[PDB]
C-alpha cells in the first residue's frame, strides 16, 4: 500500500487501511527494537540492514486520528528514538464478486440497460441520462462504498471515484441519496464525467451506487469495465493532491445469448387465418402462450436474453434492414444478412470441449468469388464477440435465398444427446419415390415421370454434395455421429443463375413447440391416399415420441433461457 519511514528529526504519521500490508522502513535510519502499541500488529520479513523489512497491520479502525503509535528505539551513543503515529481506517469498495471465467472464477457482472421500463419513454433506459422509475434499479448492478474512519477523517483527505476515459462511453453510475419525501438517484460518472468527488463524512458511512452498461461487447469493447476509488491526501493545501490508496472492481458485461429450438417455448407471436387456427391448436397442444398481434414486430427479428444472478430479461435482436418495453430489451447492429440465416445448435461437447449454450450457425460461401454472397462482417464480429456460443460457418450460397435454416433443423429426442439433426436428403426422397414405383405405384400423382427426369437428377446431384459438405462440417464442429442425423426427404431444382430452390414445400424450417412439430404440409395428398412424404416424415420421427402435424402453410417464438449459468464456463 504505502511506505512509512521514521527519523528522530520530526515525528512521522501514517494512515493504514485494514487488510493492506504497510511497509515500514526502520533500517537506514538512526541495533534497534520495535515496541508497537497494543492496537497495532507488527512483524519482520536489529542491525539497520536494509534486508530487514517491517510490516505493519492494525486491528481495528479508529474514531480519532493519531490514536496508535509504534515506538522505535535505536541503539555507546546517547539514546536515539523515533515516534511513528498510525491512523487506522477501513475502506472497501464492495460489489457482487462471488455471485475471469470458470465455475470457480471471480468478478462482477454488469448488464446493459437496454429495456424500456419507463412506459412514457420513446428510448432505452440507457439513453435517457437519468433514473425516473424505481423499477429500473432492479436491472442495474449494485455497488457499495463502505468506509470506517476517524470522526475527523477526510479533513485532510478526499475520495474520488473514476473510470478510464476509454470506458467512459460504456458505463454510467448513479449515487443513491436519503430523505423522507424522496430517495433520489443522481448522476456520478458518464459521458461527460470520468471522475467525481465524494462528500463522504467521517466515522462510519456506507454510500450506494447503481451501475448500468451502455453497450454490448463488440469489436471496440472486450466486455470489461473497471471502477476505481482513489484516496487522496490534501493535508497540505498549498500543494497538488497526492495519492495514498486506491481500490477498484471489474465488471463483466453479459453476452447476448441466442436460444435454440430445443428449449421449452414460452410465447408464440403471430404477426392466413387457417394457418393461425392450426398454430392456435398447435400452441394449445404444446401448452404455449399464443399472442396474436392485432392493431409492431417482424419475422426478421431474433429473440435472445440476458442472464445475471439478480435479473434475467429477454432481448429482441433486430434486422439491419423501435420495439422495446419493461424487461423486454432491444439491440441493433450494423442477402445473407437477414436473421433467417442465423441458427443456434443445442448444447454439445466436442472432443472434450463443452459448449453448454450450443454454437451459433450461419451460412456463407465456400470461397470469396466475385459473385458469392457473404454475411456482413459487422454481424459476424458482433456474434463472435460473445465467446460463450462460438459461432461456426456453414455453406449456403448454393441456395437461391441463402438462409442456412433451409436445409437443416434440430428436434428434441428422448435419449443420447437429447436431440436429432434433420437434414434435407434428396437421396431419401428419390428412394421413397423409386420404392413406390418398384412396388407398382409409379402411376401415382403428387411419380415415375419425375424419376425419369435427367435434369432433376443432375440438379439434385449437385445439391446432394452441397448438403453433404455441411454434414461433414457439422459432424466436425458439433461432434455429431451419423446415428444422430435424420434424413428428411426433399428434392431441389436449379433456377436462374443456377441457384438451388425447393422442388416441393420445405420439410424443415418448421414451427417446433416442445414435442409438437408444426411441419409444413407437402402437396402430395394423392399418393395412395396418405401422402408418402407425410408417412415417411412421421415414421422417421414417431419412434422419438414427437407429435407431427402438417400445416397447409410472419411469426416468432420466445423460449425459456438456459438453466446453465454462462459465467461458469471457461
Amino acid at each position: 500500500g504505502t511506505l512509512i519511514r521514521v527519523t528522530p528529526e520530526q515525528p512521522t504519521h501514517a494512515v493504514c487501511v485494514l487488510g493492506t500490508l504497510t511497509q515500514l522502513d526502520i533500517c537506514s535510519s538512526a541495533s534497534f527494537s520495535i515496541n508497537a502499541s497494543p492496537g497495532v500488529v507488527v512483524d519482520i520479513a536489529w542491525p539497520l540492514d536494509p534486508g530487514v523489512e517491517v510490516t505493519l497491520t492494525m486491528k481495528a479502525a479508529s474514531g480519532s486520528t493519531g490514536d496508535q503509535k509504534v515506538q522505535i528505539s535505536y541503539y555507546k551513543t546517547p539514546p536515539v528514538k523515533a515516534l511513528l503515529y498510525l491512523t487506522g481506517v477501513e475502506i472497501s469498495l464492495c460489489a457482487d464478486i462471488t455471485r475471469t471465467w470458470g465455475p470457480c472464477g471471480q468478478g462482477a457482472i454488469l448488464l446493459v440497460n437496454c429495456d424500456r421500463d419507463n412506459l412514457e419513454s420513446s428510448a432505452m433506459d440507457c439513453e435517457d441520462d437519468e433514473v425516473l422509475d424505481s423499477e429500473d434499479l432492479q436491472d442495474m448492478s449494485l455497488m457499495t462504498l463502505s468506509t470506517k474512519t476517524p470522526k475527523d477523517f477526510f479533513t485532510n483527505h478526499t475520495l474520488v471515484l473514476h473510470v478510464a476515459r476509454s470506458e467512459m462511453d460504456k458505463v454510467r453510475v448513479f449515487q443513491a441519496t436519503r430523505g423522507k419525501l424522496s430517495s433520489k438517484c443522481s448522476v456520478v460518472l458518464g459521458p461527460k464525467w470520468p471522475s467525481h468527488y465524494l462528500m463522504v463524512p467521517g466515522g462510519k458511512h456506507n454510500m450506494d451506487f447503481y451501475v448500468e452498461a451502455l453497450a454490448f461487447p463488440d469489436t471496440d469493447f472486450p466486455g470489461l469495465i473497471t471502477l476505481t476509488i482513489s484516496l487522496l491526501d490534501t493535508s497540505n493545501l498549498e500543494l497538488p493532491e497526492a495519492v495514498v490508496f486506491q481500490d477498484s472492481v471489474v465488471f463483466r458485461v453479459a453476452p447476448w445469448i441466442m436460444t435454440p429450438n430445443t428449449q421449452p417455448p414460452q410465447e408464440v407471436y403471430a404477426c392466413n387465418e387457417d394457418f393461425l387456427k392450426s398454430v392456435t391448436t398447435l400452441a394449445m397442444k404444446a401448452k404455449c402462450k399464443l399472442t396474436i398481434c392485432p392493431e409492431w414486430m417482424q419475422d426478421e427479428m431474433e429473440i435472445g436474453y440476458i442472464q445475471a444472478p439478480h435479473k434475467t430479461l429477454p432481448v429482441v435482436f433486430d434486422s439491419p434492414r423501435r420495439v422495446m418495453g419493461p424487461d423486454f430489451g432491444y439491440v441493433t447492429r450494423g442477402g445473407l444478412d437477414s436473421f433467417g440465416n442465423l441458427e443456434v445448435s443445442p448444447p454439445v461437447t466436442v472432443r472434450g470441449k463443452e459448449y453448454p449454450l450450443g454454437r451459433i450457425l450461419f451460412g456463407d460461401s465456400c470461397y470469396p468469388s466475385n459473385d458469392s454472397r457473404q454475411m456482413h462482417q459487422a454481424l459476424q464480429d458482433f456474434l463472435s464477440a460473445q465467446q460463450v456460443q462460438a459461432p461456426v460457418k456453414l455453406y449456403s450460397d448454393w441456395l437461391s435465398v441463402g438462409h442456412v435454416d433451409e436445409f437443416l433443423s434440430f428436434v428434441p429426442a428422448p435419449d443420447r444427446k437429447g436431440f436429432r439433426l434433420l437434414l434435407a436428403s434428396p437421396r431419401s426422397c428419390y428412394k421413397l419415390f423409386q420404392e413406390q414405383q418398384n412396388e407398382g405405384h409409379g402411376e401415382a400423382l403428387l411419380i415415375k415421370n419425375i424419376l425419369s427426369n435427367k435434369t432433376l437428377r443432375e440438379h439434385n446431384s449437385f445439391v446432394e454434395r452441397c448438403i453433404d459438405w455441411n454434414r461433414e462440417l457439422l459432424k466436425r464442429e458439433l461432434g455429431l455421429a451419423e446415428s444422430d442425423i435424420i434424413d428428411i426427404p426433399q428434392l431441389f431444382k436449379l433456377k436462374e443463375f443456377s441457384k438451388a430452390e425447393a422442388f416441393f414445400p420445405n420439410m424443415v424450417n418448421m414451427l417446433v413447440l416442445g414435442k409438437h412439430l408444426g411441419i409444413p404440409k407437402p402437396f402430395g395428398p394423392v399418393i395412395n391416399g396418405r401422402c408418402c412424404l407425410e408417412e415417411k416424415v412421421c415414421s422417421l420421427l414417431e419412434p422419438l415420441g414427437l407429435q407431427c402435424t402438417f400445416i397447409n402453410d410472419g411469426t416468432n417464438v420466445r423460449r425459456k433461457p438456459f438453466s446453465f449459468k454462462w459465467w461458469n464456463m471457461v
Partner: antibody, heavy 121, light 106 residues
C-alpha cells in the same frame, strides 16, 4: 416471506390525522407503491402512488392537498400521511406494488395486495 | 377523468355455467386494462394484467379479451370457488380509476 403488511389505523375524530405505513417483507422495495381504499359498500378507489428512488408521486383528485405519500427506502416501508380526515374518508386502506405489463400493450396492474387497515373518522 | 362502466352490476348463474362480464372504456385506451377478483373480507386478487394477459398462477378457466372499446372477462365454467365480486381497472394515466364491481351470485 414475500408479503406487504400495513398498520397505523384506528379511530380518529373528524379533523384529525393518521399516519399509515406499509412495510415490505422479503422484497427490496424497488417497485412503485400504490395505496387503494374501499369504503364499506363501495368499490375500489385508488388513492396515491410513489416511486421511492425518484420521488415522483401522484394523488387522486379527491385527496389532493389532504394526503401526503412518502417512504423510507432504508426500511423498505412506505407511509401515507392523512391530515384533516373527514367522515367521507372512512374506508379500508390497502397497499400494493405495481406489476408491469407485457407485449404488445404495456398497461400495468397491482400485485401482492396487503391486508389493509381500517380507518374510521 | 376516465370513467369505467361495468355491466351487469350482478350475475346469477349455477356451478358449471359459462359467464362473461363486460366493461366499457370512456376513451381509446391501448388495451391497458386489468381484472381483479375480491373474496368476501379479503383483499382483491389479480387475474388478468393486460387485455388477454392472464396472470401467472390463475387457472385456465379465466380468460378475457378486448372488443373495440369494450373488454370482457370470461369464465369457461363457474366452480364453487369462483363466486366473488369482480373489478375492472384502467391504469391508462397518472390517475388510476376502477369500475363499480360486478358480483357473481350462485
Amino acid at each position: 416471506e414475500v408479503q406487504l403488511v400495513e398498520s397505523g389505523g384506528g379511530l380518529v375524530q373528524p379533523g384529525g390525522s393518521l399516519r399509515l405505513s406499509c412495510a415490505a417483507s422479503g422484497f427490496n422495495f424497488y417497485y412503485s407503491i400504490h395505496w387503494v381504499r374501499q369504503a364499506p359498500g363501495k368499490g375500489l378507489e385508488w388513492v396515491a402512488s410513489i416511486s421511492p428512488y425518484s420521488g415522483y408521486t401522484s394523488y387522486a383528485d379527491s385527496v389532493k392537498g389532504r394526503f401526503t405519500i412518502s417512504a423510507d427506502t432504508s426500511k423498505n416501508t412506505a407511509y401515507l400521511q392523512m391530515n384533516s380526515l373527514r367522515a367521507e374518508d372512512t374506508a379500508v386502506y390497502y397497499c400494493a406494488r405495481k406489476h408491469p405489463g407485457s407485449y404488445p400493450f404495456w398497461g400495468w396492474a397491482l400485485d401482492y395486495w396487503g391486508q389493509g387497515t381500517l380507518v374510521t373518522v | 377523468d376516465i370513467q369505467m362502466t361495468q355491466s351487469p352490476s350482478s350475475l346469477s348463474a349455477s356451478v358449471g355455467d359459462r359467464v362473461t362480464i363486460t366493461c366499457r372504456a370512456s376513451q381509446s385506451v391501448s388495451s391497458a386494462v386489468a381484472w381483479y377478483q375480491q373474496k368476501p373480507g379479503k383483499a382483491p386478487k389479480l387475474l388478468i394484467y393486460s387485455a388477454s394477459s392472464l396472470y401467472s398462477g390463475v387457472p385456465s378457466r379465466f380468460s378475457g379479451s378486448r372488443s373495440g372499446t369494450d373488454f370482457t372477462l370470461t369464465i369457461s365454467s363457474l366452480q364453487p370457488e369462483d363466486f366473488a365480486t369482480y373489478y375492472c381497472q384502467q391504469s391508462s394515466s397518472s390517475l388510476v380509476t376502477f369500475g363499480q364491481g360486478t358480483k357473481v351470485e350462485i
